Amino acid sequence: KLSEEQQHIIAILLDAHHKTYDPTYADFRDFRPPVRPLSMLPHLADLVSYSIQKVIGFAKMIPGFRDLTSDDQIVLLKSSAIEVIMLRSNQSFTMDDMSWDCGSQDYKYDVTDVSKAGHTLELIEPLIKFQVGLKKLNLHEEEHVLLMAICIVSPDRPGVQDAKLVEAIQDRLSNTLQTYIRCRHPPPGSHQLYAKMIQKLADLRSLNEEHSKQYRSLSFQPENSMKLTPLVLEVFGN
């Protein structure tokens, strides 16, 4: 059932993820150092700005993405950026202590670190529950990278102009994912896996909404906006 075109799409998305996700976390030394109010805001703002650039690199390699206009590519990335970053960070999240382990003690982030960047339990509690539930899915890397692409290319993002073209690109990705689960994911892990994965996308939309709320309250203080980066201000708002 898995056509050669569908196998082609998976190979590209796997390669795109490997070219944009460094599992050594080497570049983290270039950030402003972490201090453990809002002592973690400089470091974590540098982390998000770094990851936005990686999300852009990944999106450019999604089949069909560069058939969209630059206006549509911009609005899809603006809307999905924080969702894809939260989804990507599942690779560093660990159940042993409910933290994001990125190679060393300096770059291990727990719930208190996120709150030392200006965010509250309104976001942190659903965020942790998202990371746990995603880990319980035990996704193949093939499914992990397909979910990242489906999240970016969604027709209902605000500001989309050629939703019909966005929908066509997403449908080709969704059919690849559904057929992949069918032929390559054995039961019982296969059980309603596609529906469970789309529920995680719905979880990410809610997390996106709460983050935007807390970001605007954060960046409304000029002393806080001083600590952000120019790319973060362009993407998330000034």
């Binding site: 650039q53 852009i56 450019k60 630059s70 911009i74 990335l77 603006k78 790319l231 362009e234 993407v235």
Partner: peptide
């Protein structure tokens, strides 16, 4: 409007 996003997209 979004010059840095456009540069990374090119």
């Amino acid at each position: 409007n979004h010059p840095m996003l456009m540069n990374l997209l090119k």
